Structure formats: structure tokens, C-alpha cells
Design an enzyme around this catalytic site. Structure first.
Site, mmCIF file in Angstrom:
data_model
loop_
_atom_site.group_PDB
_atom_site.id
_atom_site.type_symbol
_atom_site.label_atom_id
_atom_site.label_comp_id
_atom_site.label_asym_id
_atom_site.label_seq_id
_atom_site.Cartn_x
_atom_site.Cartn_y
_atom_site.Cartn_z
ATOM 1 N N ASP A 92 18.291 -9.241 55.528
ATOM 2 C CA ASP A 92 17.987 -8.800 56.879
ATOM 3 C C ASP A 92 17.442 -9.989 57.669
ATOM 4 O OD1 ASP A 92 15.310 -9.047 56.087
ATOM 5 O OD2 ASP A 92 15.141 -6.908 55.621
ATOM 6 N N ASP A 270 21.464 0.652 52.635
ATOM 7 C CA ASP A 270 20.364 0.173 51.805
ATOM 8 C C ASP A 270 19.158 1.084 51.979
ATOM 9 O OD1 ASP A 270 19.827 -1.329 54.543
ATOM 10 O OD2 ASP A 270 17.899 -1.269 53.445
ATOM 11 N N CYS A 308 23.982 12.643 34.374
ATOM 12 C CA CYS A 308 23.864 11.215 34.610
ATOM 13 C C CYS A 308 24.259 10.380 33.405
ATOM 14 C CB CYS A 308 22.415 10.907 35.008
ATOM 15 S SG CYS A 308 22.025 9.172 35.374
ATOM 16 N N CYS A 310 23.406 7.171 32.937
ATOM 17 C CA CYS A 310 22.585 5.968 32.836
ATOM 18 C C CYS A 310 21.909 5.887 31.462
ATOM 19 C CB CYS A 310 21.553 5.888 33.975
ATOM 20 S SG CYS A 310 19.938 6.672 33.680
ATOM 21 N N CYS A 313 18.886 8.240 30.730
ATOM 22 C CA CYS A 313 19.196 9.623 30.406
ATOM 23 C C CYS A 313 19.875 9.754 29.054
ATOM 24 C CB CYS A 313 20.064 10.227 31.497
ATOM 25 S SG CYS A 313 19.146 10.487 33.053
ATOM 26 N N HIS A 339 17.026 4.805 36.411
ATOM 27 C CA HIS A 339 17.748 6.050 36.612
ATOM 28 C C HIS A 339 18.092 6.257 38.084
ATOM 29 C CE1 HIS A 339 18.913 10.206 36.812
ATOM 30 N NE2 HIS A 339 18.048 10.302 37.810
HETATM 31 ZN ZN LIG Z 1 19.921 8.816 34.486
#
Ligand SMILES: [Zn+2]
Ligand SMILES: [Cl-]
Ligand SMILES: [Cl-]
Ligand SMILES: [Zn+2]
EC number: 2.4.2.29
Lengths: 373, 373
Positions: A92, A270, A308, A310, A313, A339
Site C-alpha cells: 500500500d 486484502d 477444511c 488445512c 484441521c 486455519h
Molecule cells: Zn482448517
């Protein structure tokens, strides 16, 4: 790879999906950029940010110029080398945080002087100095320096700040173009202003397109107005921008804000929400956000989110993360943040796939039904 | 794998190198155990702890019994499952932290009652209850519950606390043996007491060996006495313990403490120094510790240590870590901690290899010359 190439692969209504090619990598759009404040996406190694699916991150010029310093980062080889992220970085301009975080500010047509919020040292920003700091950092996408317009703003104040912002957009363009290495390897985005007023938004869009930029942000939103008003302004504002360049909604936002903004033609986002909310104990799930500090999770062996993909998880329970966050443990911030960023990247992937398949409208309806059940 | 098998593969003077086989894994000795306080090695994922070379970690029973609770962890499947570390875990008895961290303590021959330092809730520990909590957690190596003796202690007080500790060691043995699942799958270590007094240390060693344990800790050290005195006590204390079982120096310590303790027959160590000092900005190197906050590192592009093989030293500079720690960034704690734990594991590996090769005495001399240059 080229300096900059935006290609739209598929469309549904106002929504688009495609790619931005740059020298340091390809960015899939619609894109979400994790925020890397002062040369770190808080609580994550860059390899972890990449593993969640991020193609590009954002750096805050205001924070970097105060600590560790722009010239110091250049001496050390640039922001990418310093922090260990080798893919594109968007910076920015620093102007918004001067307004919101610094003290003793003095504004003028030339720029702004201000006192650091860390130690009271005096600093300066201007179209020329902002572009220069973003060069020193080695930013791949450079934001023009503009003047923020508070919400709510009168028509007169909105016009005056939009007009100044357009003068500053030309100065930013000229500064960027005069620096050979920057002009040949980075891209420059302009920022539309004009508050909630359709005629000002049009004048701003026309002025920015006459100057010419690589992409166009919709500025002045996500500053207090509420989602209905934000969506209403996007309805008429995004179509004013050049169709064939990326459209960037700065500082947005909640998952449902992102879905609705894509429905209105936005390609880039963002937000500090996934990182900052994560450290505070808020996890995003397809069934809505949860506060992991709540006592109901103390013996819950399920993952944060049931679908999820990820690594958090796959490996740890709500009960464990509940304990970590209640105890103030650094690993709690680490796991919640990984996560949340991964959740946001999975959201963008589902958006991209549904647009490519002509079923984004249905996805948005299904998403909202479940997220707000 | 067996419940417990300690095998000595090589010796040099009083130093030994070998292996402890347990059901959840092999422990290479001499061993350093990172400290996992309340179900986390602070600022590290368990996969990162393993990647640095750790074979076993320590858990603090006092902290775990207060938050999240021992019965809760058992309900959730045990400490290994809860925090995601599947290799051996050693748990202390909790008694030392009752003395050093809790309030309103009432001590007796039966045990101790105390007030939580977090919320004033009342709790109890005893030989029987400590062994039981360590069972609930699923600990692989269980420490007998003893009574700490402050430094300095009079001969009379040292004797009285050593004698009580030996009575409590028998009660710990009997409690452990009465619980079939624990006796068949975990190991039990006893703790030698007796302060700086050779005759008390001998009585304590004789009593513990008559009861019989899987390993023997030297207790009552690293509590204010200084390295010269600690080494003097180890000189006569370690030879009193059974030679064919592991010797554990609890709460030690600095790299040079570890080297000298191995020279005197110690096989196992734990310390919060690499993690806690790391978060505060102290990095261990082969040329001695450095304070990364110091202004001289602000533009230093070298890694923390010039030889270290850890991922932090492969990827980031002193200058970057200096910035992170000065800024209070979580990633600064993460990187400093990973390097420090990896440094400690590399130290233990060099100790193990030099003993196996009959050149540990030379290694200790070379290590000290460079570390203190
Ligand atoms: Zn997750
Ligand atoms: Cl953040
Ligand atoms: Cl610690
Ligand atoms: Zn290292």
C-alpha cells in the site's frame, strides 16, 4: 514471464476469473492477499502462507518505513529476501495508516508530515516519496498515493479529496515511470475515490483511465458504511473502471463481503481479519464464524471446520486450540491463523471454480444459506 | 519394543552414550528434552520439535493439572493425542512447581494442598495423586513425588527432607505398581536428595536402589548453588547411583553445564533455557550466547550461527530476527526457539558421537575454548 499480464478466462454476470502474470509468479483471480504488516504475516512462516494457497501477500508501507526502515531493507536486499517470500508482494502507499495511526499530522497539496506512533520521530510521505519507498522495498505491485476521505463525508469534502487524489495519481504515475528499474519490473495501480456519490466516482474513474494504470482499486470503502451501502456503491462504481484490468477492493473483508464484491466485479482483496481475528480466537467455518474461547469447545474433538483441508484441521481438535487460546499460547495464534488463511484461500478457490463452471450465482446462494444458518 | 530397555553402547571415563527403548520410541543418550509446559513446547509445532532432533519431551504436571486439567486430558485421549506428539513424554511430579509457583501451601507427611496461581482454586498433590495424574496424562516416564530442599539447607533440614523423599519414593513405587496399565507400559524414575552432603546423598542412593527404579535423577541441584558446587556434588553423587540405569539431571541447563554433567555421568537433561531465553532474544551459538536485540545485529546478514544446520539458519538473517524480536513479533519467538532447540540437539549429537569415538574429553576442551573465547 512478463512484467504484467491480466487475462480473463471466464465470466458470469459481472464476476470474472483469470490470472495476473508477473515476473515473480502467477496470481489467480479472484485473489485474497494475506497481510504482512511489518515484514511478517503474523505468526506464520512464509512457507506456511504459501502452503495455504496464497499467491501474493500485502506489505504495509507505513509500518515498514517506521520499523525496520525502507533504506535499511534496501541495503539488506529488499523485502522479499529480508522476510523470505519470493512471490509477488503488493505494497500500500502508507497514506491510510498515516491518517489512522500517526500523530501531529500536517497535510498539504505536497504531501503529509507526521509523528511516528512508536517513538515520536518525524516522517514525511508524498506521491514521490511513497513511490520511492515502495521501490526501496522492491514491491511488485505499487499503490498510488492518495488522500483518504472519512465516512461520512460531505459532497464538497468528497469532491476536494477526490480531486487531490487524482492530481496525486498523476504525480505517482510520473514518479514510477521515471525510475527505470521500477517501471520495467513492477506494476502501478490507481485508486478510485468519490465516497458514495456516483458523479464523483465517474469523474475519478475517467481521470484514472486517462492517466492509465495496470489495475484499479475502489477506494474509500470498508470505513464504516456497512455492507448494504458498500454493495450499492460497488454496483455503480466497478463498471466505471476499465473492464480489462484488475479491480481491487482494499481492506475487504468478511467472507460474505468478498462473495458479494466478486458478484459486483472485484478481482482482488486484502484483510487483516483472518490473521487478527485468528489471534483473538475467532475461526471462520462454512457454518459461520466461531469463538474458540467459548466453553462449549473445551471437550470438542472435532476440527475447527468439518470440511477444511488445512493441516490444522487434519491434526488438532477444537478442544486443544481452545486450551491454547485461553492460555495465551503462541501455538494457539499459529494454528488459528493458519486455519483462517487456509479457509480464505479455499473460499477463493471455490469462487474461481464456480465462475469457470458458470455456477457462481448458485454457489453464492448456497454459501450464504449455510454461512448464516 | 519393550516397556523399558537402557543399553550403554560406549563409555569414556564417567561419560556414557547409548539408547533407551520404550514403546513409543527410542531415546538416544545423552539426551536433551525440550520442555512442553502446558501441552505445548512454546511457539513450536510438535513436527518442528521432532525435526530439530528431539526424541522425547517433558510435560509439567503442575501446569497441566491446573489447565486444562488431568481428567479432561484423559477424557480427550491423553496428552500425546491432545497435543500431537506421538513419541515418549516424561512428566515431572508437580511438586517442585507447587513450592515455587503456588500459594497458601500446607505441607504434611501425606502430601501438600495449595492454591492455584491462576485463580485461587484449591488443589492437592501426594505420592499417590501425582502418580495418578501422570497416569491420566499417559506419561511414558513418571517421576516419583518428592519434597524439595531449598538452597542453602542446613544438615538437619536436608536430612529430614531427604528422609521424607525416600518414604515418598516407596509410596510412589507402590502406587505405580498397583495400576496395571501404567506398570506394564510406562517407566518410573526415583530422585536422589541430600543437598551438598555426601553422607545424605549416599543414604538416599542406597534407599532408592533398594526400592528399585528404571532410572535415577539427581535432585536438589540447579537451585542457586553455582556451577562449581553443582559439579562438586555430581562428582561424588552420580557414582552412588546404579551404573546400569539412566542418570537424569533435572532442570539443567546451560550448554557448558550439560557438557560437564555428561563428563560426570549424566545421561538426561531438561531445561526451559532454549525456549524461554529464545523468546527473550538470546540465541546459543558455538561462539557463546548472543543477544539478538543488540543494535550490532540490525544489518547483520549472517545466520544466528555459522555452522548450525537448522532451518532458521538456512533461511533467515540475524538482521531479520533482530527486527522481529524488537517488534514483538510472534515469528521472532518461533524462529529463535527453533534455532535454540536445534542447537541443543546438535550439541547432544556431538557429545554422543565423541563419546562413541573416544574423543569426548577433547571435544569438551575444544567446546569450552571456543564457547568462552
Ligand atoms: Zn482448517
Ligand atoms: Cl494481522
Ligand atoms: Cl519455555
Ligand atoms: Zn540455527
Amino acid at each position: 514471464r512478463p512484467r504484467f499480464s491480466f487475462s480473463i478466462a471466464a465470466r458470469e454476470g459481472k464476476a470474472r476469473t483469470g490470472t495476473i502474470e508477473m515476473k515473480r509468479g502467477v496470481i489467480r483471480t479472484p485473489a485474497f492477499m494475506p497481510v504482512g504488516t511489518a515484514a511478517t504475516v503474523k505468526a506464520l512462516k512464509p512457507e506456511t502462507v504459501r502452503a495455504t494457497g496464497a499467491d501474493i501477500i500485502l506489505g504495509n508501507t507505513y509500518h515498514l518505513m517506521l520499523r525496520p526502515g525502507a533504506e535499511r531493507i534496501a541495503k539488506l536486499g529488499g523485502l522479499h529476501s529480508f522476510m523470505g517470500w519470493d512471490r509477488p508482494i503488493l505494497t500500500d502507499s502508507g497514506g491510510y495508516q498515516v491518517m489512522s495511526l500517526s500523530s501531529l499530522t500536517k497535510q498539504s497539496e505536497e504531501g503529509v508530515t507526521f509523528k511516528s506512533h512508536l517513538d515520536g520521530s518525524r516522517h514525511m510521505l508524498s506521491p514521490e516519496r511513497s513511490i520511492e519507498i515502495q521501490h526501496l522495498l522492491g514491491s511488485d505491485i505499487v499503490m498510488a498515493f492518495d488522500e483518504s476521505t472519512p465516512y461520512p463525508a460531505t459532497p464538497s469534502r468528497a469532491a476536494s479529496s477526490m480531486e487531490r487524489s487524482m492530481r496525486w495519481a498523476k504525480r505517482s504515475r510520473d514518479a514510477f515511470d521515471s525510475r527505470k528499474e521500477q517501471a520495467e519490473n513492477a506494476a502501478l495501480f490507481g485508486i478510485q475515490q468519490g465516497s458514495v456519490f456516483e458523479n464523483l466516482r465517474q469523474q475519478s474513474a475517467d481521470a484514472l483511465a486517462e492517466i492509465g494504470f495496470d489495475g484499479y482499486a475502489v477506494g474509500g470503502l470498508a470505513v464504516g458504511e456497512g455492507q448494504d451501502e458498500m454493495f450499492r456503491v460497488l454496483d455503480f462504481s466497478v463498471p466505471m473502471l476499465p473492464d480489462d484490468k484488475p479491480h481491487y477492493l482494499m481492506g475487504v473483508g468478511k467472507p460474505d463481503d468478498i462473495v458479494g464484491a466478486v458478484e459486483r466485479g472485484i478481482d482482488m482483496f486484502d484483510s487483516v481479519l483472518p490473521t487478527r481475528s485468528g489471534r483473538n480466537g475467532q475461526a471462520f467455518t462454512w457454518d459461520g464464524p466461531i469463538n474458540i474461547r467459548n466453553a462449549r469447545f473445551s471437550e470438542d474433538l472435532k476440527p475447527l471446520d468439518s470440511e477444511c483441508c488445512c493441516a490444522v484441521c487434519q491434526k488438532w481438535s477444537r478442544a486443544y486450540i481452545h486450551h491454547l487460546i485461553r492460555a495465551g499460547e503462541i501455538l494457539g495464534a499459529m494454528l488459528m491463523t493458519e486455519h483462517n488463511i487456509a479457509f480464505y484461500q479455499q473460499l477463493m478457490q471455490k469462487i474461481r471454480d464456480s465462475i469457470s463452471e458458470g455456477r457462481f450465482s448458485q454457489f453464492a446462494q448456497d454459501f450464504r444459506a449455510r454461512y448464516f444458518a
